[PDB]
Amino acid sequence: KTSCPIKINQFEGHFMKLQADSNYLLSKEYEELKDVGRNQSCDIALLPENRGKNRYNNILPYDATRVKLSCSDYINASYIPGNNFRREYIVTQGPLPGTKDDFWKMVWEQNVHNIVMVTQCVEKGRVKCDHYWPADQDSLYYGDLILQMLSESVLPEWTIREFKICHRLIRHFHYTVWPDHGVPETTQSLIQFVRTVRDYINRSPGAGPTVVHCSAGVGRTGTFIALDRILQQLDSKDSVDIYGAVHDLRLHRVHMVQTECQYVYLHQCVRDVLRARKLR
Ligand SMILES: CNC(=O)[C@H](Cc1ccc(NS(=O)(=O)O)cc1)NC(=O)[C@H](Cc1ccc(O)cc1)NC(=O)OC(C)(C)C
Ligand SMILES: [Mg+2]
């Protein structure tokens, strides 16, 4: 119902059983998540005036968790509380040509110093996200705010950028190989990116919330943040609760972990971590 904790030394077998007879118990568990969070109004997101500010007409923040700019206060963005304090994350859609300034406004207002991006701008012949940051090193106005790229570090599977805004520094983690509605090519890769970001966060004293976005801000964003929470559980507890992590996310935004295969992927991530530790 709201959580499904599994003792780590039973996890291997529990995942086998979930996958038996064509993911029968796994699909059934995943489906139980369907309506979670949905008891809540999206009424502001639905105003006529805000329609142009939403990338997808089915992907709308809840009134109770939406980020407000300080209906001119509207951005398609939701706060996600953490286990210890509110607003661990701000989750958002890929900015649009007419919302890229609202995005940076939000970044500024909310004291964001870390952005994770788990989408590409163009995917399968469709625009998924505006290239909302500077394409080079010359400073650039986004409405009221000036952005300037100080460095761009291309790594095999993600690129790290640092920007000055005004005056503050922002780190931007762009994970470059995650197909929409699907999963990264290996568990290792996303486990390593997630651990990498978490390390930067944990050294970033007194940031705002961490921004995570993909295209709609639900599937890849949801899987990223679920994996974050689950990897931290594995370093803290002798039980792991994938279902409860995804459930927590849904309570705050529609569709987090947006397809079943992304759900299976989280279990395969756990399975792989626990296999390695087994004989260590
Ligand atoms: C399965 N796809 C969708 O729901 C996408 C929204 C979406 C969600 C998640 C992701 N993946 S991501 O979260 O990882 O970026 C991309 C796009 N929505 C649309 O394409 C929606 C239509 C839709 C699809 C499916 C559905 O059940 C209800 C309505 N179309 C749509 O919004 O068209 C505009 C852009 C012209 C307004
Ligand atoms: Mg402009």
Q: How far apart are CA 254 and CA 279, in angstroms?
A: 39
Backbone φ and ψ of 96, nearest 5° = -100, 165
Query: Are the beta carbons of 133 and 150 closer than 8 angstroms?
Result: no
What φ, ψ does residue 120 adopt, rounded to 5°?
-100, 160
214: annotated active-site residue: yes
Q: Match 């803290």 to its residue by tokens.
A: 236
Q: Is 37 annotated as a binding residue?
A: no
HSE at residue 52, side-chain half, CA atoms within 13 A, is: 8
> Are residues 145 and 151 in contact, defined by beta-carbon separation less than 8 angstroms?
no
Token readout for 100 is 């890229």
**How many Cβ atoms from other residues are within 10 Å of residue 248's Cβ?**
22
- Report the alpha-carbon distance of residue 33 to residue 35 in Å, rounded: 6
**How many angstroms separate the CA atoms of 130 and 52, rounded?**
14
- Which candidate, 50, 44, 207, 206, places its Cα nearest to that of 116? 207
CB 165 within 8 A of CB 244: no
For residue 229, give both structure tokens: 């929470």
How many C-beta atoms lie closer than 10 Å to residue 132's C-beta? Answer: 20
Q: Calculate how far, in angstroms, residue 234's C-alpha sits from the geometric centre of ligand 1.
A: 33
Domains and CATH numbers, the chain: 1-280 (3.90.190.10)
Gap between the terminal Cα atoms of the chain: 34
Across 223-247, b (16+ Cβ under 10 Å) vs e yields: bbbbbbbbbbbbeeeeebbbbbbbb
Give me ligand 2 centre to Cα 139, in Å: 13
Mutate to test the pocket of ligand 1, among 54, 55, 58, 250 (most ligand atoms within 8 A of CB): 58
Is residue 114 within 8 A of residue 211, CB to CB? The reply is yes
Question: What string of DSSP letters covers the chain?
Answer: -----EEHHHHHHHHHHHHHHHHHHHHHHHHTTTTTTTTS--TTTTSGGGGGG-SSTT----GGGEEE---TTEEEEEEE--SSSS-SEEEEPPPPTTTHHHHHHHHHHTT--EEEE-S-SEETTEE-S---S-SSSS-EEETTEEEEEEEEEE-SSEEEEEEEE--EEEEEEEE----TTS--S-HHHHHHHHHHHHHHHTTSTT--PEEEE-SSSSHHHHHHHHHHHHHHHHHH-SEE-HHHHHHHHHTTSTTSS-SHHHHHHHHHHHHHHHHHHHT-
Ligand closest to the CA atom of residue 225: 1
Check if 264 has its Cβ closer than 6 Å to any atom of ligand 1: no
| Nearest CA owner, ligand 1 atom 24 | 58
Task: Report the separation in Å between the CA atom of 208 and the middle of ligand 2, taken as the mean of its atom positions.
Answer: 25
Tell me how far the alpha carbon of residue 97 lies from the centroid of ligand 2, in angstroms.
9
Ligand 1, pocket-test mutation among 56, 128, 213, most atoms within 8 A of CB: 56
In whole angstroms, what is the distance from residue 90 CA to residue 77 CA?
7
Q: Which ligand is nearest to the CA of 99?
A: 2
Method of structure determination: X-ray
Spatial CB neighbours of 240, under 8 Å, sequence gap ≥ 6? 5, 6, 8, 11, 230, 233, 234, 270, 274
